[PDB]
Amino acid sequence: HHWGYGKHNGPEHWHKDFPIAKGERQSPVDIDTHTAKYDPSLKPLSVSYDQATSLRILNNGHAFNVEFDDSQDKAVLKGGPLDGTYRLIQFHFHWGSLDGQGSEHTVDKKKYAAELHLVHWNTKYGDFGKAVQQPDGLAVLGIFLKVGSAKPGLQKVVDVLDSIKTKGKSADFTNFDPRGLLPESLDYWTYPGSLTTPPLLECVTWIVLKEPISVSSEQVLKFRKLNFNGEGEPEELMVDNWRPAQPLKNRQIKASFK
Ligand SMILES: NS(=O)(=O)c1nccs1
Ligand SMILES: NS(=O)(=O)c1nccs1
Ligand SMILES: [Zn+2]
Numbered sequence: 001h002h003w004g005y006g007k008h009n010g011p012e013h014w015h016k017d018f019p020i021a022k023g024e025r026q027s028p029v030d031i032d033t034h035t036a037k038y039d040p041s042l043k044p045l046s047v048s049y050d051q052a053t054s055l056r057i058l059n060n061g062h063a064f065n066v067e068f069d070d071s072q073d074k075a076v077l078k079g080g081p082l083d084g085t086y087r088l089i090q091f092h093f094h095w096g097s098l099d100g101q102g103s104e105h106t107v108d109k110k111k112y113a114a115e116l117h118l119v120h121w122n123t124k125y126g127d128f129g130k131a132v133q134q135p136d137g138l139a140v141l142g143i144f145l146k147v148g149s150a151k152p153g154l155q156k157v158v159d160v161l162d163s164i165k166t167k168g169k170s171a172d173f174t175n176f177d178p179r180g181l182l183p184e185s186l187d188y189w190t191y192p193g194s195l196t197t198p199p200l201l202e203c204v205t206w207i208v209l210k211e212p213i214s215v216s217s218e219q220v221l222k223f224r225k226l227n228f229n230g231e232g233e234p235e236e237l238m239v240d241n242w243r244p245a246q247p248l249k250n251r252q253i254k255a256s257f258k
Pocket of ligand 1: 001002003004008009010013014015016017018
């Protein structure tokens with residue numbers, strides 16, 4: 001047994017094993033659109049996923065991760081609020097049991113049906129494990145999912161979920177293009193924060209896109225068929241795997257747009 005999202009091991013318990021849960025720069029947060037300062041010094045985000053190499057998809061018991069080859073500068077995030085270059089290592093999502101909840105960040109208290117996280121690590125620290133020990137170690141791009149028209153570029157991900165239903169299952173997952181998960185606009189808010197699962201390390205520059213992607217009800221339904229438990233255990237549907245908003249405290253949310 002370990003941390004999870006249930007009544008006995010969920011977000012409100014995490015602090016007992018990861019005391020930084022109560023720290024000064026925790027994620028997610030509510031993005032108050034009227035308090036976020038437009039910052040004309042922010043650069044456009046640079047997302048270069050042209051040469052991205054997906055390798056595998058994994059159910060790790062808390063979400064599913066699509067993993068990338070990060071042994072070269074093939075899929076990088078640069079510009080925006082960032083200095084230097086961050087390599088894509090994985091993406092995953094957080095979603096709800098119902099369309100009314102599921103996102104981690106909220107926007108003037110609005111919850112989206114899900115949220116995508118494309119996780120990148122600062123190439124000056126050499127590997128992901130070293131980056132997470134650093135205040136500017138990670139750059140996570142957050143994208144909101146709302147339910148409406150399907151996202152054609154998500155379908156390949158939903159169709160493989162049958163094969164990784166339970167914890168520890170993985171499947172080959174090559175030639176997936178993450179550029180088909182982006183919305184049209186790259187307007188963003190940014191603030192310094194943390195991993196939103198344990199160990200909750202305060203290593204993240206969060207870059208959250210203003211424009212949501214639209215996904216179909218059937219697509220998000222297929223997320224909710226996955227399982228937190230392993231094969232041949234009591235079936236526990238993988239839903240509501242989001243941490244609620246944490247105290248903003250001494251932080252400013254900047255906007256890249258007016
Ligand atoms: N702090 S924790 O979420 O890992 C936890 N372990 C057992 C019950 S709650
Ligand atoms: N949910 S997240 O992107 O902040 C993340 N947490 C741990 C590894 S990646
Ligand atoms: Zn996440």
